[PDB]
Design a binder for this molecule. Structure first.
Ligand SMILES: Nc1ncnc2c1ncn2[C@@H]1O[C@H](COP(=O)(O)OP(=O)(O)OP(=O)(O)O)[C@@H](O)[C@H]1O
Ligand SMILES: [Ca+2]
Length: 360
């Protein structure tokens, strides 16, 4: 009899049990409404008559009635369990407003009746999941990208940087640039493909101009995508121009620093004496860091921004895509964290605003 690990993100919900090694339920973060309640895998397939809402916008929860239902679906239909038997580890976005974790507790203890619960910070977790308690996580999902300096399991609120460049925009950026090539992707079923192509084929060029150079001069970097109907689509320098946006947001007419500088900028915002620790412990997580090349490119780029002498180390746990979860599975499982929850009876005594003093 162990705990529960529910990680909620802008596009996917990752659910399972503390003391496992991998989520058991994984399903998009979508609630479907007929212009009578559909969540999960189910929800996607029905779209044509329904309306789809995503209640997690940019890592933060904006609809609470839809959020409640994703969790109704998670416990009952996906995990087949019932909450008032289990303690729940719930995850939160770096710099989640005070109010939102409060409101989160309410739902759990009140609607769901958890005997115990918790909210931890996603970044923080993935940092654990590799085995460290100091560092800076580049976490970057379907909707939002954070750089998060962590010191002794304590994220540093002054040093966090959020950038809303992430999966969905890359998906959108591949569409845009494949469409400039002639192709067309109207429908959302076609869109589901560009999503696949991005994940199947894209990578991160080491040297962006040389690469663009190479692909104008020959076709050595081309790959074909055979569409489920039979038609094969040639994809070329699109393959690395999509994830290039991460390093240069301009591609998307954004005036933002790329994930590299953003990470430099976050390291730089900290007390000087910790930086070398962070520099050398920089963890990728989120599924938008899955592109091959990323590590090196990031190694190359921070090294051009960092002290000439300095030692860098980008860590890319092969697993990273579902690391946030995992990281908490570890935690909720740890016999030494067993007596750190907020309990049903503890809530009753203090209301939601206790979720702060006990969740630092
Ligand atoms: N192998 C891959 N290569 C590149 N991108 C990928 C890969 N696998 C998944 N992605 C992208 O990762 C995204 C999902 O990542 P993650 O699971 O961190 O999302 P999330 O937690 O829903 O997002 P957020 O942190 O933005 O709330 C999707 O945009 C998907 O297209
Ligand atoms: Ca996420």
């Amino acid at each position: 009899v162990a705990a529960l690990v529910v990680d909620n993100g802008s596009g996917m919900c990752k659910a399972g049990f503390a003391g496992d090694d991998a989520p058991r339920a994984v399903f998009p973060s979508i609630v479907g409404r007929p212009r009578d309640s559909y969540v999960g895998d189910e929800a996607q397939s029905k779209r044509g008559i329904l309306t789809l809402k995503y209640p997690i916008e940019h890592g933060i929860v904006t609809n609470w009635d839809d959020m409640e239902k994703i969790w109704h679906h998670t416990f009952y239909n996906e995990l087949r369990v019932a909450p008032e038997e289990h303690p729940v580890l719930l995850t939160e976005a770096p710099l989640n407003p005070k109010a939102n974790r409060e409101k989160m507790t309410q739902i759990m203890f009140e609607t769901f009746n958890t005997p115990a619960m918790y909210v931890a910070i996603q970044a923080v977790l993935s940092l654990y999941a590799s085995g460290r308690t100091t560092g800076i996580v580049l976490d970057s999902g379907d909707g939002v990208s954070h750089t998060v300096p962590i010191y002794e399991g304590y994220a540093l609120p002054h040093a966090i940087l959020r950038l809303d460049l992430a999966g969905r925009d890359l998906t959108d950026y591949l569409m845009k640039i494949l469409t400039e090539r002639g192709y067309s992707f109207t429908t959302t079923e076609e869109r589901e493909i560009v999503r696949d192509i991005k994940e199947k084929l894209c990578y991160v060029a080491l040297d962006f101009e040389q690469e663009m150079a190479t692909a104008a001069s020959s076709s050595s970097l081309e790959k074909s995508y055979e569409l489920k109907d039979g038609q094969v689509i040639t994809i070329g320098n699109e393959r690395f121009r999509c994830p290039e946006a991460l390093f240069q947001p301009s591609f998307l007419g954004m005036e933002a620093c790329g994930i590299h500088e953003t990470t430099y900028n976050s390291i730089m915002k900290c007390d000087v004496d910790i930086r070398k620790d962070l520099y050398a412990n920089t963890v990728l997580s989120g599924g938008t860091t899955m592109y091959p090349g990323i590590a090196d490119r990031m190694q190359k780029e921070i090294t051009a921004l960092a002290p000439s002498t300095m030692k860098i180390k980008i860590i890319a746990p092969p697993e990273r895509k579902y690391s946030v979860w995992i990281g908490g599975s570890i935690l909720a499982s740890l016999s030494t964290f067993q007596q750190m929850w907020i309990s049903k009876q503890e809530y009753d005594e203090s209301g939601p605003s206790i979720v702060h003093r006990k969740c630092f």
